[PDB]
Amino acid sequence: KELVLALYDYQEKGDSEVTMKKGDILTLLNSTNKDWWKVEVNDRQGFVPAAYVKKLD
């Protein structure tokens, strides 16, 4: 934890980004930036758009 829900699909478009599918449950690594959050998807980690993931309570 903490976990986030992928609200939308996101295809990585750079070396520090990562790909995710709508509905995936990702471990949130870092949400300090307003635009890009660091998440783990299984064996991959990297940044996705903050608008596209929802913090789970």
Q: Where are the domains of the chain?
A: 1-57
The angle at the Cα of 49, spanning 47 to 9, to the nearest 5 degrees, equals 95
Classify 57 as helix, strand or coil.
coil
Helix (H, G, I), strand (E, B) or coil at 3: strand
SS3 52: helix
Q: What is the resolution of this structure in A?
A: 1.5
- Method of structure determination: X-ray
Distance of alpha carbon 35 from alpha carbon 3, whole angstroms: 18
Q: SS3 for 51? A: helix
CATH superfamily of the domain spanning 1-57: SH3 Domains (2.30.30.40)
Q: Whole-angstrom Cα distance, residue 2 to residue 11?
A: 22
Beta strands in the chain (DSSP E): 3-6, 25-30, 36-41, 44-49, 53-55
